[PDB]
Design a protein around this ligand. Structure first.
Ligand code: CL
Lengths: 324, 307
């Protein structure tokens, strides 16, 4: 029945917390080398004997652990993605959800009533957990980057600029996939060291450059293609529109702007991740918001772009592409 | 792939809170009289204009609201089960989850590290109805519900089977709530309340003793003591009826039961969820002649034993 599905979604915070805490404990990393009996896994995690077995068995019933003759083991997915120290490790997303986002969403009611963010802005304010979270975000960025490299005919362009490039994961992957491209990452000066470390590791050399700048205070770098990944959604609409104006001014005739986000579907009735992201923007920012491709096409029209289209990218991400 | 499903479970707290807040706001009750435009719904719920439309459309995308021409309406399921003031209302679970359980589960890690705890009528109805249908109550004349609370389950049993005489047993402080339901039922002298502490005195004698979500609240030695006392209270051929959100015997499949065991960790000093096989062992040690486990109502199962 529909009511049963509704109640299951409504009480999903419990199964969520089980996985989140297992990630914070590094449970799957403890099992990386091989299976462990419950008592040994309990001892290594410093858990109390009252509920350790219940906890491990809940993970089994959720399908994220195996158990064979009393020995717990990783599933394929947890061995691949939830073991610390592997390049594919995504558990940092769960560690930060456990440490911060679960309680932030506990303030949804106050966010909805006040329209105000409920995070550190409301309060006026672990390095290894930050690093793990950044690794997971770099992994998600990589999925978008792999899709972006195939979703656009990059042979039509010689130069690309990523606006708000952070450590430069997307730009680096684009350049590695398309050796004819030259790239410029644009971000605040504080981002330079993290970007340049990835630049060094990539071996791209002079094909990649970093430009320090504040995109709300200075012009954008000229390039054939400008990329805005999860940029416009952080700001109220008038600020987003100034960026589209700057993008139009930085591009040549025939150049493109590529905007990607966890877009809501145009009818605002299908895309759960995009709509949940709009509530995340409520909780995290003073004026940020998630939008639809149709919304963005309107803004791009106002900014003078000749044409535009909406295109699926990968996972929860989609993009709007416009031509000057 | 499996990692995508895993991530969806892990981030399930978000869609959960959307539904929990909708229940706490009484949103579905506001739509009970008919569809409302978003501005009208926002105004009636006193939500800020920044994110009200986002919130309403999240409910639409989750499949719990309908929307056309900018007007929001209940789905059949929320119209039937999430409107307050109706006997069918199941939203109490969501209101209590929003007010208490979401934050309590926020302390799951401290519960796991320490072993220490970290801390509505419609919810018992499905099990109450099934209990009256799943047992041949014609074989018995008297029944006692041990830990009867406000008496919902026992009252329904007596209404369904007019030949039965019933005793609700609970702490003295429960009597006012029980009396209210007792008066409303019209059962009269066929139903009685008996005040007592089942860890301090014998249980009421009856042909059948019912333990609905009782044993799981207490440490195993105390649960075993209650089963001993049940055996002492019953006649030859009498039955003990236990029902719980049991974990499966192999402890690898029943997510509701396993989650309930973690809820018992967070809420009680000694409670735990258990399996049917567990309970049958306890029942044998307490002297019961035979026992069986049966599915009762969805995630609820019952264990029955004969003296
Ligand atoms: Cl063991």
């Amino acid at each position: 029945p529909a009511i049963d599905r509704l109640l299951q979604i409504a009480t999903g915070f419990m199964a969520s917390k089980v996985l989140l805490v297992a990630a914070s404990l590094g449970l799957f990393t403890e099992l990386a080398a091989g299976p462990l009996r419950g008592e040994e896994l309990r001892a290594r995690l410093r858990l109390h004997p009252r509920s350790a077995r219940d906890f491990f068995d809940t993970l089994v019933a959720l399908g994220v652990l195996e158990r064979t003759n009393g020995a717990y083991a990783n599933t394929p997915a947890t061995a691949q993605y939830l073991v610390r120290g592997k390049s594919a490790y995504l558990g940092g997303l769960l560690e930060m959800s456990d440490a911060r986002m679960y309680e932030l969403w506990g303030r949804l009611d106050e966010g909805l009533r006040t329209g105000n963010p409920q995070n550190e802005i409301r309060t006026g304010e672990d390095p290894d957990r930050l690093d793990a979270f950044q690794q997971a975000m770099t992994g998600l960025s990589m999925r978008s980057a792999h899709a972006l490299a195939e979703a656009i005919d990059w042979s039509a362009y010689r130069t690309v600029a990523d606006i708000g490039c952070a450590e430069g994961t997307v730009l680096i992957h684009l350049l590695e996939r398309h050796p004819h491209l030259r790239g410029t990452g644009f971000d605040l000066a504080a981002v330079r060291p993290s970007f340049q470390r990835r630049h060094e590791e990539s071996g791209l050399g002079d094909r990649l450059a970093f430009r320090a700048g504040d995109f709300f205070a200075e012009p954008l770098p000229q390039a054939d293609a400008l990329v805005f990944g999860h940029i416009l959604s952080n700001w109220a609409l008038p600020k987003a529109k100034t960026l589209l104006r700057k993008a139009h001014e930085a591009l040549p005739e025939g150049g493109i702007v590529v905007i990607y986000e966890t877009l809501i579907d145009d009818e605002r009735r299908e895309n759960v991740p995009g709509l949940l992201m709009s509530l995340t923007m409520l909780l995290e920012t003073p004026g940020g918001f998630e939008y639809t491709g149709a919304d963005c096409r309107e803004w791009l029209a106002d900014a003078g772009f000749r044409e535009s289209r909406v295109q699926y990218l990968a996972g929860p991400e989609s993009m709007v592409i416009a031509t000057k």
